[PDB]
């Protein structure tokens, strides 16, 4: 004899999709609104379990992308719209104490603004980077995003420093983390562990170099949905970090302008001191060692005796051609041609000249710009280049060389390097099984 028997609480899960809330231990990302995470995180190791993970078909990355976009929009909503700034500027070239690397990069633009009184004007000057002004045909210039989008001043109290956030699944759901240290990103994972929250992912915004990310453990990892495919970005995760030192040597002064009742526009006053180009430093020996390690783990998919070449970005906007990031409140676009200028066959610091943009078209959305307010003083930054976003050049000629060039732009690839090991599953605690019992 044998009959059904129902068990409640059995460890059975199915892959599913749900809303993952935030837990943390002002800011653009509402860290304060997040629930307080437990001081001692709980993680249960699972024995003799195999689950098929897929970093590229993951859904948590899409939710994180939507969440970051929503947080950006909700932080830029209650602050100053700069529509009066879209006016004909009369600009010259700044030449007082400028080096050879910044010849004409900054413009001294004088223009008329509305004052707090509606019927009175105001002739006020400011300093605009060459990338934020386009000529109209001293000369006449206008802000670059005045014929495509409306600018909203990044409102000076909010901070852009990425505070780590933990993505916690609701009750009735769990998150399987793939603890396998040789997990390439797509396939079965012998070592699965159940958790409730993620490991404090930093919403770092960068394009060519993954900054302040989570490192691998065993060796440098090469992840791609299809290495053979050339339309798929190759994520590279370093086992040891490469320190990058970022700096904006200019000593900027912020100047407040009354463009209306209560509304204030923060312009760049005269730079006190010497004007020097913003730049990045990366250890040459460390970078060469890391590139060699990457090539060593990159020849596996292409075989031995192949030539691995790193060249700079092949084209596109300033976001994809240059390593773009944000720190100290300022947005840097660094020409990483020195980094990827190498060929590999089977104390010195590389200096990357960076440019600064204030009219920021974040999240590649045409119709919503953002003016980053000037940051007082001199900005210095120290970051970890945790990973790379490479792209393989297509075609196949007689030569067997492969050229990998930095990519990016799509922040989904940036946030997929932190949610690769994580998967969200829905528990099914009801289960039927045979047993020899009956109700009396």
């Amino acid at each position, epitope marked *: 004899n044998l009959w059904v028997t129902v068990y409640y609480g059995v460890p059975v899960w199915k892959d599913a999709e749900t809303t993952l809330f935030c837990a943390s231990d002002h800011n653009v990302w509402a860290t304060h609104a997040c629930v307080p995470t437990d001081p001692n995180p709980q993680e249960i190791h699972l024995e003799n379990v195999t689950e098929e993970f897929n970093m590229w078909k993951n859904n948590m990355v899409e939710q994180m992308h939507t969440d970051i976009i929503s947080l950006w929009d909700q932080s830029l909503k209650p602050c100053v719209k700069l529509t009066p700034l879209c006016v004909t500027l009369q600009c010259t070239n700044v030449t007082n104490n400028i080096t050879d690397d910044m010849r004409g990069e900054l413009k001294n633009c004088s223009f008329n603004m509305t004052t707090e009184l509606r019927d009175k004007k105001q002739k006020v000057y400011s300093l605009f980077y060459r990338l934020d002004v386009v000529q109209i045909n001293n000369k006449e210039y206008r802000l670059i995003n005045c014929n*495509t989008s409306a600018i909203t001043q990044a409102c000076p109290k909010v901070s852009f420093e990425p505070i780590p956030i933990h993505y916690c699944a609701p009750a009735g759901f769990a998150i399987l983390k793939c603890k396998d240290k040789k997990f390439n990103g797509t396939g079965p994972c012998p070592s699965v562990s159940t958790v409730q929250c993620t490991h404090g992912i930093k919403p770092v915004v960068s394009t060519q170099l993954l900054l302040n990310g989570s490192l691998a453990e065993e060796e440098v990892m090469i992840r791609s*949905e*299809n290495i*053979t*495919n*050339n*339309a*798929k970005n190759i994520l590279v995760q370093f086992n040891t970090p490469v320190q990058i030192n970022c700096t904006r040597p200019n000593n900027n002064t912020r100047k407040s302008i009354r463009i209306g009742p209560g509304q204030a526009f923060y312009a760049t006053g005269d730079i006190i001191g010497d004007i020097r180009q913003a730049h990045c430093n990366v250890s040459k020996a460390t970078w060469n060692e890391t590139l060699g390690k990457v090539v060593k783990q990159l020849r596996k998919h292409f075989g031995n005796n192949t030539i691995i070449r790193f060249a700079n970005s*092949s*084209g*596109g*906007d300033l*976001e*994809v051609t240059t390593h773009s990031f944000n720190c100290g409140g300022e947005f840097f676009y660094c020409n990483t041609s020195g980094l990827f200028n190498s060929t590999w066959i089977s104390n010195d610091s590389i200096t990357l000249p960076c440019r600064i943009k204030q009219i920021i078209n974040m999240w*590649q959305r*045409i119709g919503q710009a953002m003016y980053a307010p000037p940051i007082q003083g001199v900005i210095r930054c120290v970051s970890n280049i945790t990973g790379l976003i490479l*792209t393989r*050049d*297509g*075609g*196949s*000629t007689n*030569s067997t*060389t492969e*050229t990998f060039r930095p*990519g990016g*732009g*799509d922040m989904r690839d940036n946030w997929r390097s932190e949610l690769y090991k994580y998967k969200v599953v829905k528990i099914e605690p009801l289960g039927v099984a045979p047993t020899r019992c009956k109700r009396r």
Partner: antibody, heavy 119, light 101 residues
Framework: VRLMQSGDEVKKPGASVRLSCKAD????????LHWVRQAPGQGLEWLGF????????NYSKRFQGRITMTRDMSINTVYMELRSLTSDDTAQYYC?????????????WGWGTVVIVSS | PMTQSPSSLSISVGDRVTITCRSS??????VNWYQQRSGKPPKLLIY???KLQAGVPSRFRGGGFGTEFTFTISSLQPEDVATYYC?????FGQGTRLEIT
């Protein structure tokens, strides 16, 4: 989904030809655009692709350096410029739209633009 | 790269045809077949070697998973005279020309 190309062109050797490709009927941000050239009486050959979203490009190793692809979202066009033209570049150039990044799926093709390079 | 064979073949109307697509690298199922009519731009028929693009009649079918792929059209028709192209990612293949006997 319609991809209208540009007009048949004749260039002298050593000059640069800029073809265009206007795309309409679909959101010009989600689908990558490839340029596939075909010599007379020869098989299809891939030149390179461009992502209209941010202008990211990827050129074939055979045409690298001689080719440059740009996009213009306002007029909704993708342009491809070929430099240092030589005799064997006489071909018909098509602009295809890839549906999914995996399983390259050139759904819609342009009418084609024959570039004739001759003296 | 592809090694699509044969270069051409003469086939009577209604006869079954086969087009081998012997590849040189692991292509899995990401191989598509294009039909280019004489002069007209190429048109896609089969993607992923099994699925059929909408608007294509069901006589076309594909097969293969490894380095070998097959393309069949079952009942040939007068409007099926064209060139047929393999396509794995970037690389296309040498075309197969159909000629009515």
């Amino acid at each position: 989904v319609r991809l209208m190309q540009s007009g048949d062109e004749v260039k002298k050797p050593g000059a640069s030809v800029r073809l265009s490709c206007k795309a309409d009927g679909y959101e010009f941000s989600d689908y990558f655009l490839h340029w596939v050239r075909q010599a007379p009486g020869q098989g299809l050959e891939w030149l390179g692709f461009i992502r209209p979203r941010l202008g990211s490009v990827n050129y074939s190793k055979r045409f690298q350096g001689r080719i440059t692809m740009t996009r213009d979202m306002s007029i909704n066009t993708v342009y491809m410029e070929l430099r240092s033209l030589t005799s064997d570049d006489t071909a018909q150039y098509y602009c295809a739209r890839m549906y999914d990044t995996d399983s390259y799926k050139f759904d819609s093709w342009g009418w084609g633009t024959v570039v004739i390079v001759s003296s | 790269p592809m090694t699509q064979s044969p270069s051409s073949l003469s086939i009577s109307v209604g006869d079954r045809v086969t087009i081998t697509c012997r590849s040189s690298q692991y292509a899995a199922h990401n191989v598509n077949w294009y039909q280019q009519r004489s002069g007209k731009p190429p048109k896609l028929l089969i993607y992923d070697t099994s699925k059929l693009q909408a608007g294509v009649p069901s006589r076309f079918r594909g097969g293969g998973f490894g380095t070998e792929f097959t393309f069949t059209i079952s009942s040939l028709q007068p409007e099926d005279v064209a060139t047929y192209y393999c396509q794995h990612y970037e690389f296309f293949g040498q075309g197969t020309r159909l000629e009515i006997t």
